[PDB]
Scaffold this active site. Structure first.
Site, PDB file in Angstrom:
ATOM      1  N   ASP A  94     -12.764  82.675  38.805  1.00 31.12           N
ATOM      2  CA  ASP A  94     -11.352  82.759  39.637  1.00 31.12           C
ATOM      3  C   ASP A  94     -10.632  83.202  40.421  1.00 31.12           C
ATOM      4  OD1 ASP A  94     -11.619  79.778  38.253  1.00 31.12           O
ATOM      5  OD2 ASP A  94      -9.847  80.280  37.212  1.00 31.12           O
ATOM      6  N   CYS A 136     -15.755  74.892  49.961  1.00 30.29           N
ATOM      7  CA  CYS A 136     -14.932  75.243  48.398  1.00 30.29           C
ATOM      8  C   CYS A 136     -13.594  74.235  48.398  1.00 30.29           C
ATOM      9  CB  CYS A 136     -14.822  76.218  49.021  1.00 30.29           C
ATOM     10  SG  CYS A 136     -14.687  76.802  50.362  1.00 30.29           S
ATOM     11  N   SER A 137     -12.658  75.442  48.416  1.00 30.26           N
ATOM     12  CA  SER A 137     -11.094  74.209  48.404  1.00 30.26           C
ATOM     13  C   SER A 137     -10.674  73.434  49.886  1.00 30.26           C
ATOM     14  CB  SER A 137     -10.420  75.050  47.445  1.00 30.26           C
ATOM     15  OG  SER A 137      -8.999  74.355  47.532  1.00 30.26           O
ATOM     16  N   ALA A 138     -10.352  75.586  51.530  1.00 32.69           N
ATOM     17  CA  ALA A 138     -10.460  75.049  51.974  1.00 32.69           C
ATOM     18  C   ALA A 138     -11.388  75.157  53.214  1.00 32.69           C
ATOM     19  CB  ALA A 138      -9.673  76.410  52.615  1.00 32.69           C
ATOM     20  N   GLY A 139     -13.127  75.471  52.324  1.00 30.96           N
ATOM     21  CA  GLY A 139     -13.847  75.507  53.023  1.00 30.96           C
ATOM     22  C   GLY A 139     -13.391  76.452  54.718  1.00 30.96           C
ATOM     23  N   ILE A 140     -12.945  77.832  53.986  1.00 31.06           N
ATOM     24  CA  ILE A 140     -13.564  78.935  55.142  1.00 31.06           C
ATOM     25  C   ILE A 140     -13.856  80.412  54.030  1.00 31.06           C
ATOM     26  CG2 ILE A 140     -11.312  77.844  56.155  1.00 31.06           C
ATOM     27  CD1 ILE A 140      -9.446  79.836  55.324  1.00 31.06           C
ATOM     28  N   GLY A 141     -13.182  80.334  52.772  1.00 33.32           N
ATOM     29  CA  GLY A 141     -13.342  81.692  51.906  1.00 33.32           C
ATOM     30  C   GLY A 141     -15.425  81.645  51.467  1.00 33.32           C
ATOM     31  N   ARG A 142     -15.106  81.121  50.140  1.00 35.59           N
ATOM     32  CA  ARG A 142     -17.031  80.603  49.685  1.00 35.59           C
ATOM     33  C   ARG A 142     -17.707  80.161  50.705  1.00 35.59           C
ATOM     34  NH1 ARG A 142     -14.739  78.867  44.061  1.00 35.59           N
ATOM     35  NH2 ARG A 142     -13.102  80.636  43.921  1.00 35.59           N
ATOM     36  N   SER A 143     -17.060  79.209  51.537  1.00 37.37           N
ATOM     37  CA  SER A 143     -17.535  78.951  52.645  1.00 37.37           C
ATOM     38  C   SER A 143     -18.008  79.448  53.614  1.00 37.37           C
ATOM     39  CB  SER A 143     -16.892  77.339  52.856  1.00 37.37           C
ATOM     40  OG  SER A 143     -16.794  76.533  51.841  1.00 37.37           O
ATOM     41  N   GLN A 194     -12.286  85.268  53.463  1.00 42.09           N
ATOM     42  CA  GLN A 194     -10.519  85.099  53.254  1.00 42.09           C
ATOM     43  C   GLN A 194     -10.055  86.356  53.259  1.00 42.09           C
ATOM     44  OE1 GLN A 194     -10.346  81.749  50.688  1.00 42.09           O
ATOM     45  NE2 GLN A 194      -9.326  81.080  52.172  1.00 42.09           N
TER      46      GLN A 194
END
Length: 284
Positions: A181, A215-222, A262
């Site tokens: 998390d 992912c949630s925003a599509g920029i970090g983990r993605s 991010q």
């Protein structure tokens, strides 16, 4: 500089935040005018995360062709990816329309539906074989075929049917379920094992449309997923693997979608994953 020793040099000097801020300063800025039209407000999860106009995926629809999704096309590595946000209640039909129209084989999901006590994306696939989903706005049917639950990730086989033409296709859902998390994983070992499972399925290969990753925003983990994949592929292709510059690769990917990676902790984790992954490829 090489990667592994640039890495220890940044650790010893504690300058990850300064390296990451340099990337933010140098990153491309392109217009995102379609994303910001008023009629598209409920198609965006976050007001500060938008696809650039030049690289956005268009739905094959004449009313409204907008989805928050970008085509990242890596020329030297010969890989393409679609990076998108977690679907919203009013975009689950658009999401599967994109998967269909772009001829994708796989979907890569790097978040849980609920994290930190809040909803990070819609429950956009069926959880039981006998309870299929119908998306009336885009005329698609989606059925769960099988599910394999492992300790760090789950793989699902899904059937997507275009109800207009009665054509069917098999889609693979690769769901990484253990990203914490807060922060990043302590070891990249399970993330790399997951990347290799996606690769082995054929979902990243040129005989299919681009993989869809979110992912949630599509920029970090993605961003961490496609950056690691592309860097390892370049190390296999080039005569001199130590020439691969992860910061330059990241800036190239940011020409196609804003904000990839991010935090400075995600940047460090990306380095770690490429470094460890390059040892397992061989020679090993």
């Amino acid at each position: 500089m090489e990667m592994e020793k640039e890495f220890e040099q940044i650790d010893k000097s504690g300058s990850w935040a300064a390296i990451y801020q340099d990337i933010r300063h140098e990153a491309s800025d392109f217009p995102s005018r379609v994303a910001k039209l008023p009629k598209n407000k409920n198609r965006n999860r976050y007001r500060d995360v938008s696809p650039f106009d030049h690289s956005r995926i268009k739905l094959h629809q004449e009313d409204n062709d907008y989805i928050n999704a970008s085509l990242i096309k890596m020329e030297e590595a010969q890989r393409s990816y679609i990076l998108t946000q977690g679907p919203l209640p009013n975009t689950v039909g658009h999401f599967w329309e994109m998967v269909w129209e772009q001829k994708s084989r796989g979907v890569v999901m790097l978040n849980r539906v609920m994290e930190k006590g809040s909803l990070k994306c819609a429950q956009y696939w069926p959880q039981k074989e006998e309870k299929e989903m119908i998306f009336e706005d885009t005329n698609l049917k989606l059925t769960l075929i099988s599910e394999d639950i492992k300790s760090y990730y789950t793989v699902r086989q899904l059937e997507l049917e275009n109800l207009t033409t009665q054509e069917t296709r098999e889609i693979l859902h690769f769901h990484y379920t253990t990203w914490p998390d807060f922060g990043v994983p302590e070891s990249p070992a399970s993330f790399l094992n997951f990347l290799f499972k996606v690769r082995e399925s054929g979902s990243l290969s040129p005989e299919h449309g681009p993989v869809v990753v979110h992912c949630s925003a599509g920029i970090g983990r993605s961003g961490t997923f496609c950056l690691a994949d592309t860097c390892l592929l370049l190390m296999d292709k080039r005569k001199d693997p130590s020439s691969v510059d992860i910061k330059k690769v990241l800036l190239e990917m940011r020409k196609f979608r804003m904000g990839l990676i991010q935090t400075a902790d995600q940047l460090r984790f990306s380095y770690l994953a490429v470094i460890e992954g390059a040892k397992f490829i061989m020679g090993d």
